[PDB]
Structures are given as structure tokens and as C-alpha cells.
Short mmCIF file of C-alpha atoms in Angstrom, two decimals:
data_model
loop_
_atom_site.label_atom_id
_atom_site.label_comp_id
_atom_site.label_asym_id
_atom_site.label_seq_id
_atom_site.Cartn_x
_atom_site.Cartn_y
_atom_site.Cartn_z
CA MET X 1 113.20 92.96 112.58
CA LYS X 2 115.85 92.38 114.73
CA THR X 3 118.64 92.85 112.01
CA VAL X 4 122.38 91.03 112.74
CA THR X 5 125.15 93.26 113.03
CA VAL X 6 128.81 92.20 112.97
CA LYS X 7 132.01 94.89 112.88
CA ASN X 8 130.80 97.96 110.42
CA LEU X 9 128.17 95.90 109.42
CA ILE X 10 124.26 95.81 109.47
CA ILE X 11 122.48 92.57 107.42
CA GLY X 12 118.86 92.65 106.82
CA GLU X 13 119.18 96.63 106.31
CA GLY X 14 119.16 98.22 103.00
CA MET X 15 121.10 97.08 99.86
CA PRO X 16 121.80 92.91 100.05
CA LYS X 17 125.41 91.87 101.04
CA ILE X 18 127.43 90.10 99.25
CA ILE X 19 129.21 86.80 100.01
CA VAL X 20 132.13 85.41 98.74
CA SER X 21 133.79 82.37 99.55
CA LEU X 22 137.96 81.30 100.67
CA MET X 23 138.81 77.59 98.80
CA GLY X 24 141.70 76.95 99.99
CA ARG X 25 143.99 73.54 100.37
CA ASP X 26 146.95 73.48 102.68
CA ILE X 27 147.92 77.34 104.31
CA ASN X 28 150.02 78.33 101.77
CA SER X 29 146.89 78.79 98.98
CA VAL X 30 145.02 80.07 102.13
CA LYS X 31 147.02 82.65 101.46
CA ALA X 32 147.69 83.39 98.40
CA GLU X 33 143.59 82.95 98.45
CA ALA X 34 143.64 85.41 101.79
CA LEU X 35 145.58 88.57 99.93
CA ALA X 36 143.57 88.24 96.23
CA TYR X 37 141.16 88.62 97.74
CA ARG X 38 141.55 91.64 100.29
CA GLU X 39 141.71 93.50 97.20
CA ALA X 40 138.19 92.85 96.01
CA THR X 41 134.91 94.54 97.07
CA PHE X 42 132.44 92.55 98.95
CA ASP X 43 131.02 92.77 102.71
CA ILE X 44 131.18 89.60 104.10
CA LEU X 45 133.97 86.83 104.00
CA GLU X 46 133.01 83.45 104.27
CA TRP X 47 135.83 80.77 104.68
CA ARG X 48 134.84 76.73 102.62
CA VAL X 49 136.58 74.58 105.49
CA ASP X 50 135.20 72.18 103.76
CA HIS X 51 138.02 72.31 100.76
CA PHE X 52 140.65 72.37 103.41
CA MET X 53 142.63 69.80 102.98
CA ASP X 54 144.05 69.18 107.33
CA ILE X 55 140.20 68.60 108.77
CA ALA X 56 141.23 67.18 111.51
CA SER X 57 144.37 68.84 113.33
CA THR X 58 142.11 71.62 114.27
CA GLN X 59 145.68 73.34 115.17
CA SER X 60 146.16 73.33 110.84
CA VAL X 61 142.63 74.79 111.36
CA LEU X 62 142.68 77.67 113.35
CA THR X 63 146.90 77.97 111.93
CA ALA X 64 144.86 78.76 108.63
CA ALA X 65 141.87 81.44 110.44
CA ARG X 66 144.78 83.39 111.90
CA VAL X 67 146.49 83.38 108.76
CA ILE X 68 142.79 85.10 106.74
CA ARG X 69 142.17 87.67 109.39
CA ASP X 70 145.41 88.83 110.02
CA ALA X 71 145.88 90.04 106.08
CA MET X 72 142.09 91.17 106.92
CA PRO X 73 141.04 92.18 110.48
CA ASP X 74 138.06 94.20 109.40
CA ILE X 75 136.24 91.72 107.62
CA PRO X 76 133.18 90.44 109.05
CA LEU X 77 134.38 85.82 108.72
CA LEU X 78 131.96 83.41 108.35
CA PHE X 79 133.22 80.06 109.21
CA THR X 80 131.66 77.48 107.39
CA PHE X 81 132.38 73.26 106.69
CA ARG X 82 129.25 72.30 104.04
CA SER X 83 129.01 68.66 104.97
CA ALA X 84 129.20 66.35 101.80
CA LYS X 85 125.57 65.37 101.80
CA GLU X 86 125.09 69.54 100.96
CA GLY X 87 127.31 69.80 98.09
CA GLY X 88 130.23 70.13 99.66
CA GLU X 89 133.31 68.21 99.73
CA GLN X 90 134.40 66.02 102.10
CA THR X 91 132.90 63.45 104.56
CA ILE X 92 133.37 63.84 108.82
CA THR X 93 131.44 62.63 111.29
CA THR X 94 128.55 64.02 113.61
CA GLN X 95 132.01 64.87 116.34
CA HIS X 96 134.51 66.36 114.76
CA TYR X 97 132.32 69.70 112.79
CA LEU X 98 130.58 69.82 115.84
CA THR X 99 134.38 69.67 117.29
CA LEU X 100 135.26 71.98 114.63
CA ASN X 101 132.85 74.80 114.98
CA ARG X 102 133.46 74.90 119.10
CA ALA X 103 137.12 75.56 117.93
CA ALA X 104 136.53 78.13 115.24
CA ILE X 105 133.56 80.36 118.01
CA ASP X 106 136.69 79.57 121.28
CA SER X 107 139.40 81.34 118.45
CA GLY X 108 137.31 84.20 118.14
CA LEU X 109 139.24 85.16 115.16
CA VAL X 110 135.51 84.00 113.81
CA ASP X 111 132.48 86.77 113.70
CA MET X 112 129.89 83.33 112.15
CA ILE X 113 129.79 80.14 111.98
CA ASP X 114 127.67 78.44 110.19
CA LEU X 115 125.20 75.12 111.20
CA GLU X 116 123.13 73.22 109.25
CA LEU X 117 119.90 72.18 110.09
CA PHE X 118 120.10 68.54 109.45
CA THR X 119 123.31 68.26 111.52
CA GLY X 120 120.40 67.37 114.03
CA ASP X 121 118.18 69.09 116.51
CA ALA X 122 119.35 68.65 120.15
CA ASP X 123 123.44 68.86 118.45
CA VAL X 124 122.02 71.81 116.61
CA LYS X 125 120.99 73.81 119.86
CA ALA X 126 123.22 73.41 121.70
CA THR X 127 126.15 74.83 119.24
CA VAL X 128 123.18 77.75 118.77
CA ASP X 129 124.14 78.13 122.71
CA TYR X 130 127.75 77.92 122.78
CA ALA X 131 127.98 80.30 119.70
CA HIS X 132 126.06 83.27 122.02
CA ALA X 133 127.55 82.88 125.14
CA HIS X 134 130.62 83.48 122.90
CA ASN X 135 129.00 86.57 120.95
CA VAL X 136 129.54 84.47 117.72
CA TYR X 137 126.32 84.84 115.82
CA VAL X 138 125.08 81.89 113.73
CA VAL X 139 123.95 81.03 110.09
CA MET X 140 122.34 78.42 110.53
CA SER X 141 121.34 76.86 106.34
CA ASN X 142 119.89 74.12 104.62
CA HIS X 143 120.34 72.64 101.14
CA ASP X 144 119.25 71.16 98.00
CA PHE X 145 121.30 70.44 95.62
CA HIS X 146 118.73 68.14 93.39
CA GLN X 147 115.24 70.00 93.61
CA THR X 148 113.42 72.59 94.65
CA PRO X 149 111.04 71.91 97.59
CA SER X 150 107.40 73.84 97.96
CA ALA X 151 107.28 76.57 98.81
CA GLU X 152 105.30 75.54 102.03
CA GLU X 153 108.03 73.32 102.85
CA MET X 154 110.56 75.11 102.93
CA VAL X 155 108.86 78.49 104.82
CA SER X 156 108.41 75.36 107.20
CA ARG X 157 111.91 74.59 107.74
CA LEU X 158 113.41 78.22 106.98
CA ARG X 159 111.11 78.06 110.15
CA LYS X 160 112.23 75.37 112.44
CA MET X 161 115.81 77.77 112.26
CA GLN X 162 114.14 80.87 113.68
CA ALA X 163 112.89 78.01 116.17
CA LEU X 164 116.51 76.31 117.08
CA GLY X 165 118.34 79.92 117.56
CA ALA X 166 119.34 81.06 114.36
CA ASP X 167 121.25 84.83 113.75
CA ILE X 168 120.70 83.77 109.93
CA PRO X 169 118.73 81.27 108.33
CA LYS X 170 119.48 80.78 104.55
CA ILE X 171 118.30 78.09 101.93
CA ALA X 172 120.23 77.57 98.71
CA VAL X 173 117.75 74.95 96.50
CA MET X 174 118.49 74.29 92.72
CA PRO X 175 115.91 74.54 90.34
CA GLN X 176 114.34 71.96 88.20
CA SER X 177 112.81 74.92 86.25
CA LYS X 178 111.58 78.67 85.72
CA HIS X 179 108.72 77.72 88.11
CA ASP X 180 111.02 76.76 90.94
CA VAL X 181 112.72 80.57 91.01
CA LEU X 182 109.60 82.01 91.86
CA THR X 183 108.99 79.25 93.74
CA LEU X 184 112.38 80.36 96.15
CA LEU X 185 111.10 84.58 95.83
CA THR X 186 107.49 83.34 96.66
CA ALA X 187 108.85 81.43 98.80
CA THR X 188 110.99 84.73 100.49
CA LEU X 189 107.83 86.72 100.44
CA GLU X 190 105.88 85.18 102.57
CA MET X 191 109.47 84.81 105.49
CA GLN X 192 109.43 88.65 104.95
CA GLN X 193 106.11 89.18 105.10
CA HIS X 194 104.83 86.62 107.61
CA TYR X 195 107.78 85.45 109.85
CA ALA X 196 111.15 86.22 110.33
CA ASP X 197 111.50 88.57 112.71
CA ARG X 198 115.62 88.29 111.96
CA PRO X 199 117.10 88.25 108.03
CA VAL X 200 116.95 85.24 105.96
CA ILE X 201 119.40 84.53 102.88
CA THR X 202 117.13 82.67 99.82
CA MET X 203 118.50 81.50 96.93
CA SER X 204 118.09 79.66 93.50
CA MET X 205 121.28 78.12 92.59
CA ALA X 206 122.55 77.75 89.21
CA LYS X 207 121.91 79.54 85.75
CA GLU X 208 118.35 79.54 85.96
CA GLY X 209 118.34 81.12 88.84
CA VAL X 210 120.55 83.69 88.81
CA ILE X 211 117.80 86.11 89.22
CA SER X 212 117.42 85.03 93.24
CA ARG X 213 120.70 86.88 93.85
CA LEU X 214 119.78 90.58 92.27
CA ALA X 215 116.42 90.37 93.87
CA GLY X 216 117.05 90.24 97.41
CA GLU X 217 116.47 93.86 98.27
CA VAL X 218 112.54 92.97 96.53
CA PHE X 219 111.68 90.03 97.91
CA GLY X 220 113.57 89.67 100.80
CA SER X 221 117.00 88.09 101.52
CA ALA X 222 119.72 90.12 103.17
CA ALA X 223 122.61 88.07 101.57
CA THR X 224 123.39 86.86 98.63
CA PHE X 225 126.90 85.21 97.15
CA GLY X 226 128.98 86.29 94.56
CA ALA X 227 133.28 84.86 92.72
CA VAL X 228 136.37 87.04 93.14
CA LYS X 229 136.92 88.54 89.38
CA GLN X 230 136.53 86.14 87.05
CA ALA X 231 132.50 84.68 86.97
CA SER X 232 134.39 80.55 85.77
CA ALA X 233 130.81 78.55 85.81
CA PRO X 234 127.16 79.58 83.56
CA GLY X 235 125.32 80.96 86.92
CA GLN X 236 128.49 82.97 88.88
CA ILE X 237 127.87 86.86 89.26
CA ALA X 238 131.56 88.33 89.21
CA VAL X 239 130.95 91.11 92.65
CA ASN X 240 131.98 94.00 91.02
CA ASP X 241 129.20 93.13 88.06
CA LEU X 242 126.59 91.79 90.78
CA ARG X 243 127.46 95.12 93.01
CA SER X 244 125.76 97.34 90.16
CA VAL X 245 123.22 95.49 89.26
CA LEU X 246 122.58 95.43 93.68
CA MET X 247 123.21 99.83 93.49
CA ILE X 248 121.10 99.98 90.24
CA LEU X 249 117.55 98.47 92.77
CA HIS X 250 118.49 99.76 94.92
CA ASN X 251 118.46 103.87 93.30
CA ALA X 252 115.33 103.35 91.05
CA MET L 1 106.77 81.08 68.00
CA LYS L 2 107.15 82.94 65.84
CA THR L 3 109.77 86.03 66.23
CA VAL L 4 109.17 90.14 64.52
CA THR L 5 111.87 91.02 62.84
CA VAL L 6 111.52 95.58 62.79
CA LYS L 7 114.25 97.18 60.40
CA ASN L 8 116.95 94.65 61.33
CA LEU L 9 116.15 94.35 65.31
CA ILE L 10 114.88 90.63 65.80
CA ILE L 11 112.28 91.05 68.51
CA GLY L 12 111.28 87.79 70.81
CA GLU L 13 115.07 87.39 70.57
CA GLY L 14 118.13 86.81 72.52
CA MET L 15 118.30 89.46 75.11
CA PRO L 16 114.79 91.45 75.67
CA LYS L 17 114.63 95.25 73.36
CA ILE L 18 114.39 98.11 75.08
CA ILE L 19 111.83 100.44 73.69
CA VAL L 20 112.94 104.75 74.46
CA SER L 21 109.53 107.23 74.60
CA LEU L 22 109.65 110.57 73.16
CA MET L 23 106.63 113.06 74.08
CA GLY L 24 106.65 116.28 72.64
CA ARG L 25 103.81 119.42 72.27
CA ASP L 26 104.84 120.85 68.79
CA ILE L 27 107.09 120.22 65.65
CA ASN L 28 110.23 122.38 67.43
CA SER L 29 110.32 120.16 70.76
CA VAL L 30 109.73 116.68 68.88
CA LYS L 31 113.36 117.66 66.65
CA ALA L 32 114.75 118.65 69.89
CA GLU L 33 113.87 115.80 71.63
CA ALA L 34 114.67 113.32 68.33
CA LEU L 35 117.79 115.37 67.81
CA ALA L 36 118.95 114.00 71.28
CA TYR L 37 117.63 111.01 71.40
CA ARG L 38 119.37 109.32 69.11
CA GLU L 39 122.67 109.82 71.10
CA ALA L 40 121.27 107.51 73.07
CA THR L 41 122.11 103.60 72.91
CA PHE L 42 118.03 101.80 72.48
CA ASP L 43 115.87 99.68 69.68
CA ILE L 44 112.96 101.21 69.94
CA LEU L 45 111.87 104.35 70.09
CA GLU L 46 108.11 104.91 70.76
CA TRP L 47 107.14 107.82 70.12
CA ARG L 48 104.14 109.51 72.39
CA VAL L 49 101.69 110.66 70.29
CA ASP L 50 98.92 112.33 73.48
CA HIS L 51 101.58 114.98 74.24
CA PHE L 52 101.02 116.51 70.69
CA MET L 53 99.26 119.04 71.27
CA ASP L 54 97.54 119.14 67.39
CA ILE L 55 96.34 115.37 67.33
CA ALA L 56 92.61 117.15 65.65
CA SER L 57 95.34 117.43 62.84
CA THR L 58 96.49 113.87 60.03
CA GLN L 59 99.29 116.73 58.48
CA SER L 60 100.08 118.40 61.44
CA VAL L 61 100.54 114.68 63.14
CA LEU L 62 102.34 113.00 60.07
CA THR L 63 105.36 116.33 60.21
CA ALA L 64 105.99 116.22 62.98
CA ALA L 65 106.45 111.50 62.55
CA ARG L 66 109.12 113.04 59.49
CA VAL L 67 110.42 114.45 61.57
CA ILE L 68 111.51 111.67 64.07
CA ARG L 69 111.99 109.72 60.68
CA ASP L 70 114.66 111.61 59.14
CA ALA L 71 116.45 112.59 62.60
CA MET L 72 116.89 108.86 63.04
CA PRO L 73 116.30 106.82 59.77
CA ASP L 74 117.63 103.98 60.64
CA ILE L 75 114.99 102.68 64.70
CA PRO L 76 112.24 100.87 64.81
CA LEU L 77 109.49 103.73 65.03
CA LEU L 78 106.47 102.71 66.77
CA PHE L 79 103.52 105.56 67.09
CA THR L 80 101.54 105.20 70.09
CA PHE L 81 98.41 107.40 70.75
CA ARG L 82 97.71 106.41 74.76
CA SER L 83 94.39 107.20 75.26
CA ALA L 84 93.75 109.27 78.28
CA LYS L 85 91.42 105.82 79.76
CA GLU L 86 94.73 103.74 79.85
CA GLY L 87 96.79 107.09 80.89
CA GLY L 88 97.33 108.83 78.65
CA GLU L 89 97.10 112.71 78.03
CA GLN L 90 93.89 113.02 76.27
CA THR L 91 91.29 111.85 75.32
CA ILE L 92 89.93 111.60 72.21
CA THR L 93 86.46 110.18 70.18
CA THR L 94 87.00 106.35 68.77
CA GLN L 95 87.35 107.91 65.39
CA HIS L 96 90.08 109.77 65.55
CA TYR L 97 92.12 107.32 66.96
CA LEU L 98 91.62 104.64 64.61
CA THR L 99 92.12 107.61 62.06
CA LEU L 100 94.98 109.10 63.20
CA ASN L 101 96.58 104.87 63.22
CA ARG L 102 95.68 104.82 60.22
CA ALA L 103 96.66 107.82 58.84
CA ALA L 104 100.38 106.89 59.63
CA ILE L 105 99.98 103.01 58.31
CA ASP L 106 99.69 104.69 55.07
CA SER L 107 102.63 107.58 55.85
CA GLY L 108 105.34 104.19 55.50
CA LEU L 109 107.04 106.46 58.06
CA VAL L 110 106.46 104.00 61.27
CA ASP L 111 107.91 100.55 61.30
CA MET L 112 104.65 99.59 64.32
CA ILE L 113 101.44 100.57 65.50
CA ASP L 114 100.44 100.33 69.24
CA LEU L 115 96.24 99.36 69.47
CA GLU L 116 94.65 99.21 72.66
CA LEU L 117 92.92 96.22 72.85
CA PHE L 118 89.82 97.94 74.70
CA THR L 119 88.94 99.93 71.95
CA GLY L 120 86.87 97.68 70.90
CA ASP L 121 86.99 94.08 69.53
CA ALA L 122 85.75 94.47 65.85
CA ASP L 123 87.30 98.34 65.34
CA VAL L 124 91.03 96.15 66.91
CA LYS L 125 90.92 93.69 64.79
CA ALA L 126 90.35 95.59 61.07
CA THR L 127 92.77 97.96 62.01
CA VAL L 128 94.97 94.80 62.49
CA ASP L 129 94.15 94.44 59.23
CA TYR L 130 94.33 97.28 57.53
CA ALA L 131 98.01 97.24 59.51
CA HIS L 132 99.32 93.89 57.64
CA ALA L 133 97.74 94.75 54.64
CA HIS L 134 100.45 97.44 53.83
CA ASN L 135 103.07 95.75 56.47
CA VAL L 136 102.56 97.55 59.60
CA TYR L 137 103.36 94.86 63.01
CA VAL L 138 100.96 96.20 65.80
CA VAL L 139 102.04 96.16 69.44
CA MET L 140 97.72 95.47 71.09
CA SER L 141 97.95 96.81 74.26
CA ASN L 142 96.44 96.70 77.91
CA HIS L 143 97.01 99.40 81.41
CA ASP L 144 95.48 99.01 84.78
CA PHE L 145 96.92 102.21 86.29
CA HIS L 146 95.46 101.45 89.66
CA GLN L 147 95.85 97.73 90.14
CA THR L 148 97.01 94.18 89.22
CA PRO L 149 94.34 91.46 88.08
CA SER L 150 94.86 87.65 88.93
CA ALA L 151 96.98 84.98 87.34
CA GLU L 152 94.30 84.21 84.89
CA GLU L 153 92.71 87.29 84.28
CA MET L 154 96.60 88.37 82.51
CA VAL L 155 96.59 85.86 80.60
CA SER L 156 93.09 85.10 79.12
CA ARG L 157 93.94 88.97 78.45
CA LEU L 158 97.13 88.39 76.62
CA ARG L 159 96.04 84.99 74.64
CA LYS L 160 92.71 87.35 73.62
CA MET L 161 95.64 89.80 72.17
CA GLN L 162 96.91 86.62 70.06
CA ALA L 163 92.92 85.82 69.20
CA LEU L 164 92.98 89.29 67.71
CA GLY L 165 95.93 88.78 65.65
CA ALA L 166 98.21 91.06 67.06
CA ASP L 167 102.47 90.87 66.18
CA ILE L 168 102.86 91.77 70.12
CA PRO L 169 101.00 91.66 72.95
CA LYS L 170 101.61 93.62 75.42
CA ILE L 171 100.30 94.43 79.60
CA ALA L 172 101.47 96.96 81.84
CA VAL L 173 100.00 96.51 85.73
CA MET L 174 99.78 98.92 88.47
CA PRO L 175 101.07 96.26 91.74
CA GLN L 176 99.52 97.83 95.13
CA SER L 177 102.26 95.26 96.85
CA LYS L 178 105.27 92.86 96.07
CA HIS L 179 102.83 90.09 95.60
CA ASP L 180 100.98 92.06 92.56
CA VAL L 181 104.24 91.61 91.39
CA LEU L 182 105.27 87.90 91.27
CA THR L 183 101.66 87.88 89.87
CA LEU L 184 103.27 90.05 86.11
CA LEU L 185 106.43 87.63 86.56
CA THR L 186 104.12 84.05 86.45
CA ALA L 187 101.53 86.03 84.00
CA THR L 188 104.41 86.13 82.05
CA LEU L 189 105.94 83.00 83.06
CA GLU L 190 102.88 81.01 82.08
CA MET L 191 102.20 82.12 79.29
CA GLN L 192 105.82 82.05 77.68
CA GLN L 193 105.96 78.20 78.77
CA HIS L 194 101.34 77.11 77.24
CA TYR L 195 100.20 79.50 75.15
CA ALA L 196 102.13 82.46 73.32
CA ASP L 197 103.51 81.94 69.82
CA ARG L 198 105.06 85.54 69.19
CA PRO L 199 107.05 87.73 71.52
CA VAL L 200 104.53 89.28 74.60
CA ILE L 201 105.84 92.24 77.02
CA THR L 202 104.68 92.14 80.00
CA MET L 203 105.66 95.01 83.38
CA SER L 204 104.96 95.90 86.84
CA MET L 205 104.38 99.63 87.00
CA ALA L 206 105.73 101.48 89.70
CA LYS L 207 109.24 100.87 92.05
CA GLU L 208 108.16 97.75 93.62
CA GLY L 209 107.91 96.48 89.73
CA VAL L 210 111.26 97.54 88.47
CA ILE L 211 112.41 94.25 89.21
CA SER L 212 109.96 93.41 85.71
CA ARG L 213 111.69 95.58 83.66
CA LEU L 214 114.79 93.51 83.79
CA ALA L 215 113.70 89.86 83.92
CA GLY L 216 112.23 89.56 81.48
CA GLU L 217 115.21 87.33 79.28
CA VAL L 218 113.84 84.78 82.40
CA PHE L 219 110.27 85.05 82.45
CA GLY L 220 109.92 85.53 78.98
CA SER L 221 108.89 89.35 78.28
CA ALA L 222 110.56 90.21 74.67
CA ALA L 223 110.80 93.75 75.23
CA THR L 224 111.11 96.82 78.46
CA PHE L 225 111.08 100.14 79.06
CA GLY L 226 113.22 102.96 79.77
CA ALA L 227 114.87 106.96 80.11
CA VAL L 228 116.98 108.31 78.71
CA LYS L 229 119.54 109.77 80.46
CA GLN L 230 118.69 111.17 83.38
CA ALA L 231 115.88 108.67 85.30
CA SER L 232 113.68 111.42 86.79
CA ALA L 233 110.97 109.77 89.35
CA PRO L 234 110.74 106.41 91.24
CA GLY L 235 110.48 104.00 89.19
CA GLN L 236 112.09 104.76 85.52
CA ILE L 237 115.87 103.11 85.56
CA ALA L 238 118.47 105.31 82.92
CA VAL L 239 118.50 103.38 79.65
CA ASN L 240 122.55 102.50 80.46
CA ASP L 241 122.23 101.03 84.06
CA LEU L 242 119.41 99.32 82.10
CA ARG L 243 121.46 97.99 79.44
CA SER L 244 124.06 97.25 81.88
CA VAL L 245 121.94 94.56 84.07
CA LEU L 246 120.49 92.99 80.92
CA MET L 247 123.75 92.70 79.65
CA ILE L 248 124.74 91.53 83.21
CA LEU L 249 121.73 88.66 83.22
CA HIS L 250 122.14 87.48 80.45
CA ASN L 251 125.72 86.71 80.24
CA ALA L 252 125.44 85.12 84.00
#
């Protein structure tokens, strides 16, 4: 089990790390959000690039990335364009998606990039290799916003990500029942115990899957996602509440 | 699903109820503990009678029960003699055990009694019937301090308790691995979804089973156990910490 060290954060050891997501449609809203978020305590900042309106311009995207980086110089920054197929906000071509991740990698402004496994094995492996050559870590991901696959299916998908070179495999699935939540925890534990040689992020969405966000230290998920202040919809947990539950579980 | 109402507490609805256990070797230590515990917030007080040294005298036991009741007149009080076979502190004959539970039932000082399922089916059913005739609820229990039985075994034991008339079936088992924790949660959920027509208390012990104490609202356990202030050994959770995690999970 190889941990992942980014800036002064060690992923895969100790309590699960807290990721928060920043979402702004343009440079001014990204800046307002970055200044608000630096007054919150969290471990990793994810920038959800699919919410940005001017994604057609690589320079616009990099200018926004710089705004975030100047507001929070020491935070690990994860660049994520979530495709519409996986719940993202906009559809873009495979070429443009790969261009944006490469521009981000080249900028030296981000520490990690999110790569969707279903982008295609050749393109995924090529990008992973490009990232690695530039000292950028890769969060390889997959999201099923509709249902929960079987435990065997989830473990084989996670193993496939490890085979393609992911630094950190990630899977997020939607529960249709409480039983589906147990399936996600089971698959997490199977990965932890027998196949992972690196940190894995797993999560069951919505209100019924909230426990998956709190029990990562037990079953093996290295990071979790929380909301900056004000949790709005069912199933979101504000970062301070999330942090208090993770410390309680850790010191029990 | 029939809930259980004791004093103004409804067991089986809303957040899991918090039980704390009081442990004193004699009348003066029981009184000192009862005065300390009334400055803590919890829902049900369990009196662990097997820690009391003068169990040979029914009158001594009832005098102590009165000390507790006068210190906390409105709290639901559960009378529990835990046998040494199930992790208790002293061994007593089946006759004496049944005598003590009957004296407690007759006193009108306690609201519920704990009855170990393995006491023997005829004696268990007789005591359950005696309790019910005196408006006392029965927590029917079973504890495996060594290992975790299979999910099928646990569900059939819980179903057997429901068949013998338990108001609230309870099972506590020791995990030998993280997998054993998932088994306990699975058995809880199976009971919840298909066989329980009453509240069920389930718990996985020790540090590895702590999550079972926090996720009852999700998988179906109606109560959990916490420590009054100062958690001492690994795996105990202080009641205020436990309460904060249960409210966070409930309002997510």
C-alpha cells in the first residue's frame, strides 16, 4: 500500500481526507468562491471545471485556475471536468476534454487531475502517462448516478483503474435501497483487504448513502466529500460536521 | 412494526436511543453514581446488577433500585443482571436470577428487565409472561463475547426472541475482523426489512465494531450504548460524542 503525498497531505493514512468542491460560472464568481472557501477547514480543494462557462478557451480556464491558486497557495488542488454522462454539467468532445486536462497538467497550478475511466483505455493511459511525467497525480473515476453495480463489478472496475495507472481510483454510485449501501461498503472492504496497493475513494450517494461518507476509516475509503458551510440538499454534510464525526470515529 | 413507549420515550422511532450503564458494588457507590449520572444527557438508564455485591439479598437489591429511582424519577430504568456466561461479573443459579427479575418486576421501580435468551425457553417465556402481566417490558438478549455468528444464525436467534415474546430483542457480538462488522449490519438490515415487528437492538463490540453503534438509524438498531463522560477503553464513545454523531446522521 503506497500512500499519495501532495503538498503536506498524506492520502491513504490516518483519517479520511475531506474534499470540497468549488463551482463558479466565470472568473469573478470563481474568485468570490475561493475567498469564501479559504475561511473553511478542509484538506483538498476540487475545482469543478464543468460549471465554468468559458471552457472553450484554454486561457480562460487557466486564468481561473490561477485565481484559485493565488487565493490558496498551499492547498492541494484537484482539477475536475465532470462529463455530462457522469453527472457533469456540460458535454464536450473527448478531444477538448483531453486538451483541458493537458493544459492543466502543463500549467503547474494543479496537483491532481480527475480522469474518467470510461473516457477510453488508450486515451486514459496516455493522459495518465503525461500527468506522471509532469509530477501530477491522477484521481481515476467512475460514477453511476442511477444505481449500484454488484460488489464484483465495482471491485473489477477499481482494479481496472489500478491497472491503467491511477494514483487514486474513485467510484461513486447511487443506492436504490439500504442494501445497495452495504454493497458499496463490502466492495470497499474487499478492495482494501485484497487488491488495493494504493488509496481508493468510494462513496454511496444521496441521503441513504451518507454513512459511506463517514465510515471510510473503517472500510477503506481514503477521502470523502463535504459541503462548505450550509449543507443545502438532503445527503450533504457540512465540513465541520463531517470533521467532527471523522475525529470521533478515529479516536474511539 | 410496534414501537415501545416507556415513560415519555418512544423506542423504535426517530434517532436510536442512548443507553448508559450504571455499575456500583454497594448502596453508597450506587447512590454516588446515580447522582453523577443525572448530570449527563441520555435516554435509558441500565442498572448492571451483576456488579452489585449483595445480590444474595433481594431486599438489598431493591433498596439500591430505590436509590436510583429517587435520584432519577422520570428516567426509563432497565434492570439487568448480566450472567458470567455472557460477560457478566458473577455466576448465580437460574433460580436466583429468576427470583431477582421477579422481585424487580414486582417492586414497580423498574420499567424494563433484561432476560437472557439462553436462560432456557420455558423459564424465559414464563418470566416474559409475568413481566407483561405487571406492565414491565422485556429486553431479551444474547451476547457472544468471542466471535460473530453468521448473519443467518443471528437473524434466527432474533426471530426466536420475537417468538418468545420479547418486547425488544437484543444481540451483541464480538468482531474478529472488519468483515464480521458488515455481517452484523447485514443481519440488522435483514431483520429490519423482513422479520421485525418490534424494535431490535444490535451491536458489534470493541473498537472495530464502533460504527455499529453510530449507524443504527440507517440499518435498524433502535438503541445504542454509550459511556457517561470520559470514555476509558478503546471502543467506548462518550454520550455527548455519540449524541452529536446521531444528530448529524439524522439531519443529513
